[PDB]
Amino acid sequence: KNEPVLDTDGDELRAGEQYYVVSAIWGGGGGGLALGRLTNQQCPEIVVQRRSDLDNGIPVVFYNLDSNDDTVRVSTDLNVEFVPIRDRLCLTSTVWKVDNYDTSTGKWWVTTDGVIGNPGPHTLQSWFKIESGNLGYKFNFCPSVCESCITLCSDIGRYGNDGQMRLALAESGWPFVFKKAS
Amino acid sequence: KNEPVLDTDGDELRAGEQYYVVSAIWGGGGGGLALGRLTNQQCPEIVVQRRSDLDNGIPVVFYNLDSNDDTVRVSTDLNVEFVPIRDRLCLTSTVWKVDNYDTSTGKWWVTTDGVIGNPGPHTLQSWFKIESGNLGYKFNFCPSVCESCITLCSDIGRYGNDGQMRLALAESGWPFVFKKA
Amino acid sequence: KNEPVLDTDGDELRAGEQYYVVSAIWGGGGGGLALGRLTNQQCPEIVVQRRSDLDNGIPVVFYNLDSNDDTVRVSTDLNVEFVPIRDRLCLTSTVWKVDNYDTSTGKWWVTTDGVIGNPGPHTLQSWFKIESGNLGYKFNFCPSVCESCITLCSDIGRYGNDGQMRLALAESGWPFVFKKAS
Amino acid sequence: KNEPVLDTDGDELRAGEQYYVVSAIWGGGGGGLALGRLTNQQCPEIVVQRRSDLDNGIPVVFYNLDSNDDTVRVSTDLNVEFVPIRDRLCLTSTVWKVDNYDTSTGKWWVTTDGVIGNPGPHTLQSWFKIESGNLGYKFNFCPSVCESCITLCSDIGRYGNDGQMRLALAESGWPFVFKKA
């Protein structure tokens, strides 16, 4: 099988365990990932990166394709879900998913209201991979859960949008590391 | 557009919504802000800080330059208004404003009886910015609503006055966080 | 019997219980009391007040004249002793004591290397009273443990010396409150 | 004379004694300071901050203007020098100094190869002050050693560079505390 993803302690990532997704860069790297909103949309919430290094954001859990695999490995399709500490107003899910194309910017943003499990055409937009990079791990959207589906296939970068640093498909991915939220 | 200010849950501040303004440094750093009075002046009320770090104080609401903008963002002039948790006594508003110079102390205090809206020279003293701090956020008085006006331009810090902890212009601002009320 | 001294919770002070001695003034009031040194004297350490509101200093305990009185009351002679949280280099005690007259400043400072117990002429300089003031409690040095002794009789104020806020006999005392340390 | 700087035990800093310089804000605020190297520059070593708040870095010593003054006090020009816990490659000193302006970033970095003593125009870049922060202490570069010299005058903050956390002149200083080494 593929190499396990490791956290900042060097331990292998476990499916269902909570991790902050924090910038790999030390010095001007920013904080962790979390939830935000847009001017014209309160729900679903979008994925943003904190500007402050002090703020690790909201933890995520990862779920594997097969719930009998407890280890999170590189280059395998996963679900990603924020675990907010307090209840949220939005009724949409906090599962990551690729958004519909944004004609105002030309970007495919990462949003939420994704779905956990049921790999196939219905959930195609909710499957992400974690890949090794030079500066740290990167997310990649290139699902293999529906062989006959036509799909985008691209690393996940970061881009500013109306004062918030969002995640979007990009040629080169932004590097992250994973820190135990325990 | 500028970075949205966030509350302690991580959600952007919304214009018109109530927030406690609470010291980002607890313990002897105190608690939240509130309306107060002075020994020699019942009205207008002044801006004070509660000593107990368990006391969130009295919430404020923020108003943007343009009432169509609902996100409160850093480095933008806004109005700050206490929710009027007070007796029926003062006819003055609960809107923050920079006072006239205090010859007894050398301080430029934050007080109330400010005004909402009408950006320009008439309301210049009622416009405050929220800026990112080392931790939390700090207030800064440096209005740009009147390009030709000469203005003070300074962070907001804390100073003792009349046996109380007040807010005044200071070289280095005191950090606060914003809690949903 | 004299009124009990109360802590910031409204509870009566107990002999031998640890309290921070913090400035009663909120706004430009400074922090708590602790120990310092002088340029020409490392031991005994001197009593100072922290400039920073955030620093409650070192807690003290109070001891009564009679070890069988558990309540600390106003206008009664007490011993005051810092309880440092870690061992200190000086071999002198951390019990408060009025110093010998300082010809360099004209002040009678509060220093340490005091003694606990044995009220009378030998320990006279180690006895302090707590009094109600306008703005909080104040310390008063006016011991009655030796009726035939001539003694100074004055409130304890604060006064700067060598960049430190020291305590000294003064016409008007500095107000304090007592905050449970544990 | 000025207020003595205190270490994390509450004891005044002594000139010539070793101290770790550790961020007053932990977690994502980082750990202590250390000697570092740039990708493209082995010497002089630069001043960096460790990411782990468990890593105290390596100690500095402070030298006063007058060798007869043993207390380190706020708002006074001093020299800062890392204990030379390093390999023997560099002939440069471990004394902190403000660098020449960096056109690639717009920053005035803190680097080493400073000089101890001889206050005046020749050593101007090697004099720093320790100032009280909202919490802990901040460094400030605003030398008074050469009255006729024109000098920068600014707090010291932190900034990323070359994949590392460096110190540079900044509007608002980053707060540190001092731990006996």
Side-chain angles (χ1 to χ4, degrees):
Chain A
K1 285 141 323 190
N2 287 355
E3 298 266 312
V5 184
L6 307 177
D7 66 19
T8 57
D9 294 323
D11 295 334
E12 336 188 310
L13 260 69
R14 291 281 118 91
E17 191 173 326
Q18 286 187 53
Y19 301 93
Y20 298 110
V21 184
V22 296
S23 211
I25 302 321
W26 176 232
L33 298 183
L35 291 164
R37 62 160 290 165
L38 301 176
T39 307
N40 285 308
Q41 150 189 141
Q42 154 183 60
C43 306
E45 288 173 282
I46 53 149
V47 180
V48 297
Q49 180 193 16
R50 292 289 188 253
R51 180 193 81 70
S52 170
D53 299 352
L54 310 188
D55 192 341
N56 295 322
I58 303 176
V60 305
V61 295
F62 303 102
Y63 293 119
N64 275 317
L65 277 162
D66 156 35
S67 72
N68 289 133
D69 299 338
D70 67 17
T71 299
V72 179
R73 312 181 174 269
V74 297
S75 319
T76 66
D77 285 325
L78 320 168
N79 301 143
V80 187
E81 177 177 37
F82 281 121
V83 184
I85 54 198
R86 77 184 288 261
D87 260 298
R88 311 201 62 92
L89 285 209
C90 289
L91 298 189
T92 42
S93 88
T94 55
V95 180
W96 292 14
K97 85 191 262 184
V98 174
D99 205 353
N100 298 318
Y101 180 72
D102 177 10
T103 62
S104 74
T105 64
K107 295 275 159 35
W108 301 87
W109 305 108
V110 182
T111 187
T112 61
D113 207 29
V115 171
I116 287 156
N118 193 18
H122 308 303
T123 60
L124 181 91
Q125 300 158 298
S126 294
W127 296 97
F128 299 85
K129 297 175 160 86
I130 297 166
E131 313 278 14
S132 296
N134 39 345
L135 303 185
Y137 295 106
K138 67 190 198 178
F139 291 99
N140 173 267
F141 177 75
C142 194
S144 332
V145 301
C146 171
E147 151 158 50
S148 52
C149 290
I150 291 160
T151 182
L152 302 155
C153 183
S154 182
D155 283 355
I156 305 282
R158 77 178 190 177
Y159 290 106
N161 182 59
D162 300 351
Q164 303 185 97
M165 169 67 66
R166 297 186 62 175
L167 303 182
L169 265 42
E171 175 169 62
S172 325
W174 188 262
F176 296 100
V177 293
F178 306 104
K179 167 191 192 52
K180 288 187 186 74
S182 71
Chain B
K1 211 46 208 72
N2 288 352
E3 155 179 18
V5 181
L6 312 175
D7 70 23
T8 53
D9 299 319
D11 304 315
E12 68 173 46
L13 266 50
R14 305 287 295 174
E17 178 172 349
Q18 302 183 9
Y19 299 94
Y20 302 108
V21 185
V22 186
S23 175
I25 305 172
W26 52 87
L33 305 178
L35 294 156
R37 328 198 163 274
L38 294 165
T39 290
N40 55 338
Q41 159 191 315
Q42 279 186 126
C43 305
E45 300 143 302
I46 59 168
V47 182
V48 300
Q49 177 196 27
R50 303 285 203 238
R51 188 163 185 178
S52 172
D53 69 4
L54 310 172
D55 189 340
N56 290 320
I58 302 310
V60 302
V61 300
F62 300 102
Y63 298 109
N64 273 318
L65 278 165
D66 171 7
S67 63
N68 295 316
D69 298 340
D70 291 353
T71 301
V72 177
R73 319 185 169 260
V74 300
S75 301
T76 64
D77 284 328
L78 42 75
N79 304 133
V80 188
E81 192 189 15
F82 276 120
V83 175
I85 307 303
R86 82 211 170 132
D87 296 343
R88 179 57 162 79
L89 175 62
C90 297
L91 304 184
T92 49
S93 81
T94 58
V95 180
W96 293 13
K97 169 222 181 273
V98 176
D99 196 13
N100 297 318
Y101 180 71
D102 183 0
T103 59
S104 71
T105 63
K107 295 310 190 252
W108 301 87
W109 301 111
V110 183
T111 188
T112 66
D113 204 29
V115 290
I116 290 168
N118 191 22
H122 307 312
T123 61
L124 180 135
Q125 291 155 308
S126 290
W127 294 102
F128 296 86
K129 284 174 173 89
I130 298 171
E131 311 280 5
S132 301
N134 290 333
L135 75 173
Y137 303 88
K138 65 200 181 175
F139 294 97
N140 177 269
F141 178 74
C142 192
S144 36
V145 295
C146 172
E147 68 92 341
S148 43
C149 290
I150 300 195
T151 182
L152 305 157
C153 182
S154 191
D155 287 345
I156 302 302
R158 297 169 320 133
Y159 288 110
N161 188 230
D162 194 39
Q164 295 170 92
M165 187 66 72
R166 291 191 69 185
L167 297 190
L169 271 51
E171 172 152 26
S172 302
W174 188 261
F176 296 93
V177 300
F178 304 105
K179 305 178 164 173
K180 293 178 177 75
Chain C
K1 205 46 208 83
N2 298 352
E3 277 302 81
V5 181
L6 311 173
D7 69 21
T8 54
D9 297 323
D11 295 327
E12 308 176 353
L13 258 66
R14 291 273 118 81
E17 184 169 338
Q18 292 193 31
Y19 299 94
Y20 296 109
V21 182
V22 310
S23 180
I25 303 297
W26 177 233
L33 306 175
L35 297 142
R37 62 159 294 166
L38 298 174
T39 66
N40 276 341
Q41 154 184 324
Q42 153 186 66
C43 305
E45 293 180 83
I46 55 143
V47 180
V48 298
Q49 184 205 5
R50 294 283 192 253
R51 194 195 65 72
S52 169
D53 288 6
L54 315 179
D55 199 323
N56 290 323
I58 299 171
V60 305
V61 293
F62 303 105
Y63 297 119
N64 276 314
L65 284 160
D66 172 14
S67 92
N68 295 135
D69 298 354
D70 284 82
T71 303
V72 177
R73 304 173 182 278
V74 298
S75 316
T76 64
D77 286 327
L78 305 171
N79 301 141
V80 188
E81 178 183 26
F82 280 122
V83 183
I85 76 178
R86 90 166 171 132
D87 298 341
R88 305 202 63 94
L89 285 82
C90 290
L91 257 45
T92 43
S93 94
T94 58
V95 180
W96 294 10
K97 179 171 70 131
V98 175
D99 206 353
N100 298 317
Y101 180 69
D102 182 1
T103 64
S104 89
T105 65
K107 295 287 187 302
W108 300 88
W109 304 110
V110 180
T111 188
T112 63
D113 205 29
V115 185
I116 307 276
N118 188 27
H122 306 311
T123 63
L124 177 143
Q125 294 155 305
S126 290
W127 295 101
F128 296 87
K129 293 181 168 63
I130 298 170
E131 318 277 357
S132 294
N134 326 310
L135 304 174
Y137 296 104
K138 67 201 186 167
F139 286 102
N140 175 250
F141 175 73
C142 190
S144 26
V145 299
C146 174
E147 145 167 70
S148 64
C149 292
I150 287 156
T151 178
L152 300 159
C153 186
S154 186
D155 289 343
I156 304 299
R158 66 183 201 162
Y159 201 86
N161 181 238
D162 109 277
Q164 296 181 104
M165 192 45 88
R166 295 190 65 177
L167 297 185
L169 274 49
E171 211 200 308
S172 71
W174 185 264
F176 296 103
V177 296
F178 308 100
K179 163 174 181 53
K180 285 191 189 70
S182 45
Chain D
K1 197 46 208 63
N2 287 354
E3 162 183 12
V5 184
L6 312 174
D7 68 23
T8 53
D9 296 321
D11 302 315
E12 78 177 33
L13 268 53
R14 305 289 290 178
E17 178 169 345
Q18 298 184 10
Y19 299 92
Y20 302 110
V21 185
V22 187
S23 178
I25 301 167
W26 57 90
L33 300 182
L35 289 166
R37 285 186 172 129
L38 295 167
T39 294
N40 57 314
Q41 168 186 132
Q42 286 183 303
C43 301
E45 290 128 338
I46 58 170
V47 180
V48 297
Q49 174 196 31
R50 304 293 191 216
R51 194 175 183 165
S52 171
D53 66 8
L54 302 178
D55 189 333
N56 277 351
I58 56 155
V60 302
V61 302
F62 302 103
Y63 290 116
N64 277 321
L65 275 163
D66 180 338
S67 39
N68 286 335
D69 294 332
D70 294 327
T71 301
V72 177
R73 324 185 165 257
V74 301
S75 302
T76 64
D77 283 333
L78 44 69
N79 303 137
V80 187
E81 180 181 33
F82 276 118
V83 178
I85 299 172
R86 80 200 166 142
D87 68 27
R88 283 185 91 182
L89 151 70
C90 293
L91 306 170
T92 47
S93 86
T94 61
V95 178
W96 295 12
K97 98 174 226 203
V98 177
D99 198 8
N100 296 319
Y101 183 68
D102 175 15
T103 61
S104 70
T105 61
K107 293 307 188 283
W108 301 88
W109 301 111
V110 182
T111 187
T112 63
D113 206 26
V115 174
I116 298 298
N118 188 24
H122 311 315
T123 63
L124 182 120
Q125 298 156 301
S126 290
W127 297 96
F128 296 85
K129 295 171 159 83
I130 298 170
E131 314 275 7
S132 298
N134 293 326
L135 74 167
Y137 304 88
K138 54 200 198 163
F139 292 101
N140 174 265
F141 178 73
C142 191
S144 319
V145 299
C146 169
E147 187 164 32
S148 62
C149 293
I150 289 184
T151 181
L152 298 158
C153 184
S154 188
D155 281 2
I156 302 304
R158 308 176 306 147
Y159 210 78
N161 180 245
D162 186 48
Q164 294 178 89
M165 201 32 93
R166 292 191 67 188
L167 310 180
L169 265 61
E171 172 170 29
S172 303
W174 189 258
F176 297 96
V177 299
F178 304 103
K179 303 189 177 168
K180 284 180 188 76

PDB file of all heavy atoms in Angstrom, chain A residues 18 34 56 92 182:
ATOM      1  N   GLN A  18      -8.600  13.664  14.840  1.00  0.00           N
ATOM      2  CA  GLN A  18      -8.678  15.093  14.548  1.00  0.00           C
ATOM      3  C   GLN A  18      -7.286  15.701  14.394  1.00  0.00           C
ATOM      4  O   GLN A  18      -6.412  15.476  15.237  1.00  0.00           O
ATOM      5  CB  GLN A  18      -9.443  15.788  15.671  1.00  0.00           C
ATOM      6  CG  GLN A  18     -10.938  15.517  15.617  1.00  0.00           C
ATOM      7  CD  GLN A  18     -11.704  16.345  16.622  1.00  0.00           C
ATOM      8  OE1 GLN A  18     -11.574  17.564  16.662  1.00  0.00           O
ATOM      9  NE2 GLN A  18     -12.530  15.688  17.419  1.00  0.00           N
ATOM     10  N   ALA A  34      -9.871  26.680   8.199  1.00  0.00           N
ATOM     11  CA  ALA A  34     -11.089  26.881   8.967  1.00  0.00           C
ATOM     12  C   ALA A  34     -12.227  27.204   8.003  1.00  0.00           C
ATOM     13  O   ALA A  34     -12.103  27.010   6.789  1.00  0.00           O
ATOM     14  CB  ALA A  34     -10.882  27.992  10.017  1.00  0.00           C
ATOM     15  N   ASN A  56      -4.674  27.918  14.796  1.00  0.00           N
ATOM     16  CA  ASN A  56      -4.630  26.654  14.063  1.00  0.00           C
ATOM     17  C   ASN A  56      -5.929  26.337  13.336  1.00  0.00           C
ATOM     18  O   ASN A  56      -5.977  25.339  12.609  1.00  0.00           O
ATOM     19  CB  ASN A  56      -4.299  25.501  15.010  1.00  0.00           C
ATOM     20  CG  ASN A  56      -2.907  25.622  15.610  1.00  0.00           C
ATOM     21  OD1 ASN A  56      -1.965  26.030  14.937  1.00  0.00           O
ATOM     22  ND2 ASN A  56      -2.782  25.282  16.883  1.00  0.00           N
ATOM     23  N   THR A  92     -25.886  22.928   6.307  1.00  0.00           N
ATOM     24  CA  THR A  92     -25.046  22.193   5.372  1.00  0.00           C
ATOM     25  C   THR A  92     -23.956  21.437   6.131  1.00  0.00           C
ATOM     26  O   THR A  92     -23.622  21.756   7.268  1.00  0.00           O
ATOM     27  CB  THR A  92     -24.408  23.151   4.366  1.00  0.00           C
ATOM     28  OG1 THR A  92     -23.960  24.331   5.052  1.00  0.00           O
ATOM     29  CG2 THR A  92     -25.436  23.569   3.309  1.00  0.00           C
ATOM     30  N   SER A 182      -5.512  16.816  19.600  1.00  0.00           N
ATOM     31  CA  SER A 182      -5.621  16.391  20.992  1.00  0.00           C
ATOM     32  C   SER A 182      -4.789  17.284  21.916  1.00  0.00           C
ATOM     33  O   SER A 182      -3.555  17.272  21.871  1.00  0.00           O
ATOM     34  CB  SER A 182      -5.185  14.930  21.131  1.00  0.00           C
ATOM     35  OG  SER A 182      -3.781  14.798  20.966  1.00  0.00           O
TER      36      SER A 182
END
